[PDB]
Design a protein around this ligand. Structure first.
Ligand SMILES: N=C(N)NCCC[C@H](NC(=O)[C@@H](N)Cc1ccccc1)C(=O)Nc1ccc2ccccc2c1
Ligand SMILES: N=C(N)NCCC[C@H](NC(=O)[C@@H](N)Cc1ccccc1)C(=O)Nc1ccc2ccccc2c1
Lengths: 150, 48, 150, 400, 150, 50, 50
């Protein structure tokens, strides 16, 4: 218990001296025991799906609940959780004169949630009748909406 | 045989049915220590 | 902020009001219809309830002398005197149960020295119980004082 | 008569005491303001001051903070009653004080204010009362969870039934002002989307800019706007963002104003969205029956909707499950210890039926008055088994 | 400034996926308000150490800290010990040299609040008002006059 | 006890599965514990009877 | 970096939960060493450069 605390309270001192790519990625200080015990396979028989549809449902329903339950050390997902995957064609960038930098900027602008204030603010005028929260930009949902990014 | 076994608490009533035994269980065994020692002593020393 | 064409200076005061006010106007408390603030201290999930409330006055006592004109402390919602009444009413019950045991021991045994062994029996057992609670981890609670009565 | 006076005798956990200090929370309807709820907190302060001078010493109101959570709808007033000596009768004690606060204010007025004694207890342990919660275990959203929650609350009070009192925790649901910023209209005139997001963000909601020093210490620096320029939906066009070609552009150009329906509090239990239900048992039923007759209503709803009991209650209760097992080993150890100093198969049975002799008297005093089977009574039983064991062992020891 | 939906997936959900691999634990709950304030509650087993339980919860949130908005980072994230209920509530009023319900709340949070939370193991303090801050009220009409933005 | 609570959390997940989704169990240490208790307690009763 | 190896851009929401968003390239344009010249980075003077 105490051995895990001191190791992750020292790594954290040297966290700022790492690349910004590694910071947003998953750093983890867990308790290890080189050996599995309960391996729970997940297959399909009737309504057939791929080895990708299954790994998403395992990591979006039962994986978050398993690692939390009865003191599990660390869980290893056998596949990958779903993610809005984009495959940049290099020939179709040169056609319209563009780079991967312009694609990344388009997603970090349109695909984002902004913190707008609220009508009838925290310090209001005496005698205001209503008070609601403002919504502005919303994070995208499906494959169709990601295809319509200008 | 009724205080201490009832003091096998469970859950949010941990120190509720526990403390209302063991506290008085120490009072029972110290009254047995005061009835085997000292109460015999002063009865013989001075009474009539 | 800026310097417009003709050498005129634009300042932050010129474009905006500047008042030294609160960081958050979402809440403002009163006390019997009088403008006021306060300190809502909550327990630390294992703290020593009353001893923590006694040291709330300890730190507060060194603050009192350096107060501006008019600033005075008041005490609404306080659990301190409920602890002081539970000890004053159980120890009152303790002394009442000894004095009434004395009257029953005098009616049956008219000897004054006979009504004395049981009078100096239970006081010894009550003190011994405090020694066992200190050695096991228990404290003077509402339960281990009503337990002294029972 | 001993079995009849035990099952009919109801079950509490710990009696709610006079603490000399209670409170009363406020709750206003959809989209109320700070000025509206302040009128309600003033009327509450009058009842305790002018209409209750003898019982109350001081009130401590707080506008915009209930124990539900936060917002300018809620409120709370920490009452601090006079000492016990100046409050003599039962009328001047907490129970009677908060009784003519509820059914009085409720019915009249417009908002909802209660008043209630402080549970000595903890957050849990009301007794004859549960805490349910409904989970979204599939890919349906919050809008579809609202419909399933309304169907659980409906069917519960549709057939009572040895009743079941049930209301939601606080998902009232109020409207929100959505602003759709068209991305093609913005870039055409030449405004950056970065500039537009921190215009709306650092004006209406506020923005943490930097730190400064005031009188030795170090505090914060915020930026927003004068009150009048951010109250109504028509004042959005008053802001003008600058474009790359050195000229002003109004918000109304690229924006689109339109109302919607959201929720001001999205609860989530265990990595998944949820909706808390604070229900209760009937005057007839009690806990165990009310919970199992809420589970077959929880499984009668559409797909992708399950349940999980959230969330103070419990882990094996006291009047029930626990008590049986505790008294069971109390008989197995009593029998063995009455034998270590006796040697028979008859002497210990004499002491093993003075249990009901003294117990019938304890059940008679509690059921006669307004007391109930709680913690203080259940340990008063085991003490009377030790006092009935004592007297009877003297009748068995000297006689043998 | 963020509304209920904004904080529900930008702060709340980020921590909840990274709230795993902890010793003990029965369940987790959460409340994401429209004011812009999330609060999680990991209730552990009875008789568990509250000292070590606080360490593991704040050494896992910290892994998902970089995946949050930069607004929330500079704001006050806090992992304290909770006990839903106050005990010592210390009101602060004025009688002689009169001041507002804003001047008082600053002096409470710049003299005695920092000292109270530190003293005798306090769980968490709730200031009844707000600490002072250089507040600026940007006039929109006086920005357009000199051609400017927030 | 950790492997028993792996089924506890998994059991509440089962009802809300799509069509065809079924759970299987390769590589499992659970029944080796149940055989070591069933073969030592069998040895215990055999040593008493002999 | 954001073509051959991949790059963590932003977060989105899929069916209630919150997942990740990645950016790379179709499989065929990053298998061989001769496919490096297929990418063209833009210069300050508005024209492509291999
Ligand atoms: N289960 C309970 N209630 N207590 C376990 C305590 C463990 C051990 N003391 C013991 O192990 C003995 N109580 C056990 C025992 C010894 C001899 C005869 C019977 C039982 C002991 O360490 N006692 C205590 C007591 C209080 C403490 C308070 C704070 C910090 C440490 C403490 C340690
Ligand atoms: N978060 C909210 N709003 N309520 C939780 C309160 C818990 C519980 N009482 C109830 O749950 C009752 N509201 C149930 C009920 C009883 C009778 C008619 C309708 C509903 C309770 O413990 N005390 C009471 C007693 C009676 C009440 C009647 C109306 C409103 C609140 C009440 C609270």
């Amino acid at each position: 218990d105490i051995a895990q605390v001191q190791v992750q309270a020292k790594l954290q001192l040297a966290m700022p001296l790492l690349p910004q790519e590694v910071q947003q990625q998953g750093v983890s200080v867990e308790k290890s025991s080189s050996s599995f015990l309960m391996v729970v396979g997940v297959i399909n028989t009737d309504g057939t799906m791929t080895q990708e549809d299954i790994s998403d449902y395992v990591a979006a329903n039962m994986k978050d609940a398993i690692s939390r339950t009865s003191g599990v050390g660390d869980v290893q997902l056998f596949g990958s959780q779903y993610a809005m995957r984009i495959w940049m064609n290099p020939n179709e960038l040169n056609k319209f004169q563009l780079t991967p930098v312009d694609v990344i900027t388009a997603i970090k602008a349109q695909n984002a949630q902004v913190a707008a204030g609220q009508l009838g603010g925290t310090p209001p005028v005496k005698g205001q009748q209503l008070n609601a929260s403002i919504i502005a930009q919303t994070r995208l949902t499906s494959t169709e909406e990601f295809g319509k990014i200008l | 045989a009724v205080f201490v076994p009832m003091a096998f608490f469970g859950g949010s009533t941990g120190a509720i049915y526990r403390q209302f035994s063991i506290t008085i269980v120490s009072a029972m065994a110290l009254s047995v220590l005061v009835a085997l020692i000292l109460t015999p002593a002063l009865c013989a020393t001075m009474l009539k | 902020l800026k310097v417009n064409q003709d050498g005129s200076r634009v300042l932050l005061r010129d474009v905006a009001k500047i008042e030294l006010g609160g960081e958050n106007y979402d809440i403002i408390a009163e006390f019997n219809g009088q403008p006021a603030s306060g300190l809502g201290i909550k327990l630390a999930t294992g703290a020593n309830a009353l001893d923590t409330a006694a040291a709330i006055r300890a730190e507060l006592a060194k603050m009192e002398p350096f107060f501006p004109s008019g600033l005075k402390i008041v005490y609404p919602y306080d659990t301190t005197p409920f602890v002081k009444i539970s000890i004053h009413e159980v120890v009152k019950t303790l002394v009442e149960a000894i004095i009434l045991v004395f009257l029953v021991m005098y009616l049956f045994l008219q000897n004054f020295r006979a009504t004395l062994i049981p009078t100096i029996a239970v006081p010894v057992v009550l003190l011994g119980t405090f020694a066992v609670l200190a050695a096991f981890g228990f404290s003077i609670n509402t339960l281990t004082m009503f337990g002294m009565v029972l | 008569g001993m079995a009849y006076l035990f099952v009919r005798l109801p079950s509490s956990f710990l009696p709610d005491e006079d603490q000399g200090v209670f409170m009363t929370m406020v709750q206003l309807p959809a989209g109320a303001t700070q000025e509206r709820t302040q009128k309600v907190l003033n009327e509450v302060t009058h009842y305790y001051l002018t209409k209750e001078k003898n019982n109350v010493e001081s009130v401590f109101a707080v506008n915009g903070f209930g124990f539900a959570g936060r917002g300018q709808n809620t409120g709370i007033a920490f009452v601090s009653l006079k000492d016990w000596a100046d409050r003599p009768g039962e009328e001047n004690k907490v129970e009677a004080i908060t009784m003519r606060a509820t059914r009085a204010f409720s019915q009249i007025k417009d908002a909802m204010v209660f008043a209630f004694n402080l549970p000595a207890i903890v957050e849990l342990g009301t007794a004859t009362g549960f805490d349910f919660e409904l989970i979204d275990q599939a890919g349906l959203g919050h809008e579809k969870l609202t419909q399933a929650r309304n169907q659980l609350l409906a069917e519960a009070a549709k057939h009572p039934d040895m009743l079941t009192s049930v209301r939601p925790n606080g998902l009232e649901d109020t409207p929100q002002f959505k602003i759709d910023i068209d991305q093609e209209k913005a870039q055409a005139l030449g405004v950056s989307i970065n500039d537009i997001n921190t215009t709306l963000g650092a004006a209406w909601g506020g923005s943490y800019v930097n730190d400064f020093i005031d009188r030795g210490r170090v505090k914060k620096v915020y930026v927003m706007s004068e009150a009048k320029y951010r109250m109504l939906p028509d004042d959005i066009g008053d802001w003008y963002v600058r474009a790359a070609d050195g000229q002003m552009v109004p918000f109304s150009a690229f924006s689109s104003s339109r109302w919607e329906y959201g929720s001001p509090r999205l609860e989530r239990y265990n990595g998944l969205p949820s909706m808390e239900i604070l229900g209760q048992a009937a005057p007839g039923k009690s806990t165990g029956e009310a919970m199992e007759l809420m589970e077959q209503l929880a499984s009668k709803l559409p797909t992708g909707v399950g349940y999980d009991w959230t969330g103070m209650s419990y882990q094996e209760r006291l009047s029930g499950n626990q008590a049986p097992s505790l008294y069971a080993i109390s008989l197995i150890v009593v029998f063995l210890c009455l034998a270590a100093l006796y040697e028979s198969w008859s002497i210990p049975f004499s002491v093993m039926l003075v249990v009901p002799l003294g117990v019938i008297g304890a059940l008679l005093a509690a059921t006669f008055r307004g007391l109930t089977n709680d913690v203080y009574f259940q340990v008063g039983l085991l003490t009377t088994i030790g006092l009935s064991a004592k007297n009877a062992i003297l009748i068995v020891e000297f006689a043998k | 400034g963020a509304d209920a939906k904004t904080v529900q997936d930008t702060v709340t959900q980020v921590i909840e996926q990274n709230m795993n691999g902890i010793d003990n634990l029965m369940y987790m709950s959460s409340n994401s308000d429209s004011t812009g304030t999330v609060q999680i509650t990991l209730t552990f087993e009875s008789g568990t150490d509250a000292d070590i339980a606080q360490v593991q919860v704040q050494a896992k949130l910290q892994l998902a800290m970089p995946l949050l908005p930069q607004e929330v980072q500079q704001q006050g994230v806090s992992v304290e010990k909770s006990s839903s209920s106050f005990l010592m509530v210390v009101g602060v009023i004025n009688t002689d040299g009169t001041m507002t319900q804003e001047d008082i709340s600053d002096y409470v949070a710049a003299n005695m609040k920092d000292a109270i939370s530190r003293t005798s193991g306090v769980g968490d303090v709730q200031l009844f008002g707000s600490q002072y801050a250089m507040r600026i009220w940007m006039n929109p009409n006086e920005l357009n006059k000199f051609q400017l933005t927030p």
